């Protein structure tokens, strides 16, 4: 009887009734970042080809042309790499999520690594693009943390394999791709889901699509976006909650209802200093 609102999902949360939360997050909870979604008119990555050198938009991610020239991806790396952006507000609410013992799994299509650099580790992550943090041999397909490889990458050499001189390219998917590995947690883990949380993003892509209707029909799908479009809007359920406008606002509302605030403050303090 009547739609569920944001306080509704906070109390579901802070009793504990929702404790299996599975997030999905996209563009939208990095630029307060300062990372423009890349097809951004103007300060997205997609329109200033001449500043890193590309004749078209997707050959930074595409494998023929890494191979030609290398050095416009390991651009996009350099200023991508762990340290130089910051996780905001939203990061830090996942974050504090973790802590509580309430996050099951984040699956992420961002490949800015603020979730890692927040303090989730890599177990709860689904990196569903790749990653940063690691880094494969072309070749012989020998992996690399990503720290092994930062120098090189900092100081603008194409990083190579000690073993077979290959190019050691960072673990993020190029178009074509297959998905990694780590994507086939989906299939136990949204069964498993009693809680369904969307930020910055309408997942309108397949196979991320699909996944917003794997979860049970008892289970609340929390929109946190711009806008109410995509698959949720397209197939609505009788417990899903849209919270629209700002991100920023959105997760700090929720924050505020779940009386978070005061730990997100000393959170966020205490990992700036870092
Ligand atoms: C879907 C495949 C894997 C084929 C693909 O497009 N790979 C290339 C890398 C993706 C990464 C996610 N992505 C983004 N698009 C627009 N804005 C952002 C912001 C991102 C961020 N903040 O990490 S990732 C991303 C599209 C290109
Ligand atoms: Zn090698």
Avoid at 54 to 81: C, D, G, M, R, S
Avoid at 95 to 111: A, C, S, V
Avoid at 122 to 147: D, I, M, N, W, Y
Wanted: net charge negative.
């Amino acid at each position: 009887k009547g739609k569920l609102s944001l306080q509704d999902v906070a109390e579901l949360i802070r009793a504990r009734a929702c404790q299996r939360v599975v997030v999905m997050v996209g563009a939208g909870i990095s630029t307060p970042s300062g990372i423009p979604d890349f097809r951004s008119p103007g300060s997205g990555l997609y329109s200033n080809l001449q500043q890193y050198d590309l004749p078209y938009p997707e050959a930074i991610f595409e494998l023929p042309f890494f191979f030609h020239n290398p050095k416009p991806f390991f651009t996009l790396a350099k200023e991508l790499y762990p340290g130089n952006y910051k996780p905001n507000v939203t990061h830090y609410f996942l974050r504090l999520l973790h802590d509580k013992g309430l996050l099951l799994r984040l699956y992420t299509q961002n490949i800015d690594g603020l979730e890692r650099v927040s303090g989730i580790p890599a177990s709860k992550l689904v990196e569903a693009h790749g990653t940063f943090a690691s880094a494969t041999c072309t070749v012989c397909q020998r992996p690399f943390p990503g720290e092994d490889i930062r120098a090189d990458v900092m100081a603008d050499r194409v990083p190579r394999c000690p073993v077979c001189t290959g190019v050691v390219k960072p673990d993020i998917v190029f178009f074509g791709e297959p998905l990694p590995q780590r994507f086939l947690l989906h299939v136990v883990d949204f069964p498993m889901a009693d809680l369904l949380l969307i930020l910055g993003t309408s997942l309108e892509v397949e196979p991320f699509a699909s996944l917003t209707e794997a979860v049970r029909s008892s289970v609340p799908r929390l929109l946190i976006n711009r806008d109410l479009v995509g698959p949720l809007a397209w197939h609505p359920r009788s417990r899903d909650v849209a919270q629209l406008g700002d991100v920023v606002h959105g997760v700090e509302s929720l924050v505020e209802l779940l009386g978070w605030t005061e730990e997100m403050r000393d959170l966020v303090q205490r990992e700036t200093g870092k």
